[PDB]
Ligand binder design. Structure first.
Ligand code: NO2
Ligand code: NO2
Ligand code: CU
Ligand code: NI
Length: 306
């Protein structure tokens, strides 16, 4: 429901509070409309996002995304997300998908927000799929925040292409992404893939001593939630992280490159990890392809579509 007089901030005890991030009674007019709003953190000192509860109108909402950043794109009450999520780096934290219910964060794992370094804003993205009561929508996510230092820190290792070109009518275009991991060990517990209409399959592995350990494999045309990892996977100083997207050009009249519009593409694998608080960092990114010849021994599963 829509909040009203009671406010978005709910105390749970002396150190915990829930924060409801809701669309400010919005009303769409077209199909596939993307709405976005932001919420400054109520505390200025450091806190840990320890849990998420979805509050979605199961009739209208296709998916939701929650980000953490410091410069939301619009100082507005809400905006068309085409304008942008964040001017700075948008950190993904939560992803709700309609027909793919999210898995909870492991216990003891939490994101670092606020303080000197952590995110100062939450930004919410709500995709509306199908559209007549003239109702004002307040769908969103309720977020459990604590000030208690969590022993394990959640983080994101984003893997993304940039230089990809998909020629028109080209049967198979591969986008390889590879990086050497150079931090304290991390443990991947969930993953999410992102592609636009041209992607067929996305796969992420850990290569250690020349052997591929599957992190995640998915059709990007399937709902784009965070799916849990079958068996938790440690990546460690030395290991190489490797991802491939498979694209088709068939159907397109002109060549497609990486971009933000629906006629552009994207090969994004979001690896969600946790680290020991004392070693932890919160976000890593790989946009390089440091070991391209290594992809010669990529598992055949990464090329056959699920
Ligand atoms: O992450 N070694 O069990
Ligand atoms: O997923 N649209 O860039
Ligand atoms: Cu995209
Ligand atoms: Ni382990």
């Amino acid at each position: 429901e829509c909040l009203g007089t009671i406010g978005p901030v709910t105390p749970l005890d002396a150190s915990d509070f829930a924060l409801d991030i809701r669309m400010p009674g919005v009303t769409p007019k077209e199909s596939d409309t993307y709405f976005c709003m932001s919420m400054r953190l109520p505390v200025d000192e450091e806190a840990f996002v320890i849990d998420f509860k979805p509050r979605a109108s199961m009739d209208t909402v296709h998916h939701m995304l929650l980000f953490g950043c410091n410069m939301p794109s619009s100082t507005g009450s809400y905006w068309f997300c085409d304008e942008g999520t964040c001017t700075d780096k948008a950190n993904i934290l939560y992803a709700w998908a309609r027909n793919a219910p999210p898995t909870r964060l492991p216990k003891g794992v939490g994101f670092r927000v606020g303080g000197e370094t952590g995110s100062k804003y939450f930004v919410l993205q709500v995709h509306y799929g199908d559209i007549r009561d003239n109702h004002k929508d307040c769908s969103g996510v309720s977020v459990h925040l604590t000030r208690v230092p969590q022993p394990l820190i959640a983080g994101m290792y984003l893997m993304m292409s940039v230089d990809t070109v998909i020629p028109p009518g080209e049967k198979v275009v591969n986008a390889d992404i590879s990086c050497q991991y150079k931090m304290y060990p991390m443990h991947v517990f969930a993953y999410r893939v992102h592609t636009h209409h041209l992607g067929k399959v996305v796969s992420g592995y850990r290569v250690r001593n020349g052997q591929w350990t599957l992190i995640g494999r998915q059709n990007p045309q399937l709902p784009q939630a965070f799916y849990p990892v079958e068996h938790p996977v440690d990546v460690t100083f030395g290991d190489i992280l490797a991802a491939r997207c498979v694209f088709t050009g068939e159907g397109r009249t002109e060549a497609t490159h990486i971009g933000g519009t629906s006629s552009d593409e994207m090969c994004n694998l979001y690896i969600m990890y946790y680290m020991e608080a004392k070693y932890a960092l919160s976000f890593m990114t790989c946009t390089k392809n440091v070991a391209p010849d290594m992809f010669r021994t990529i598992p055949a599963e990464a090329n056959i579509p699920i």
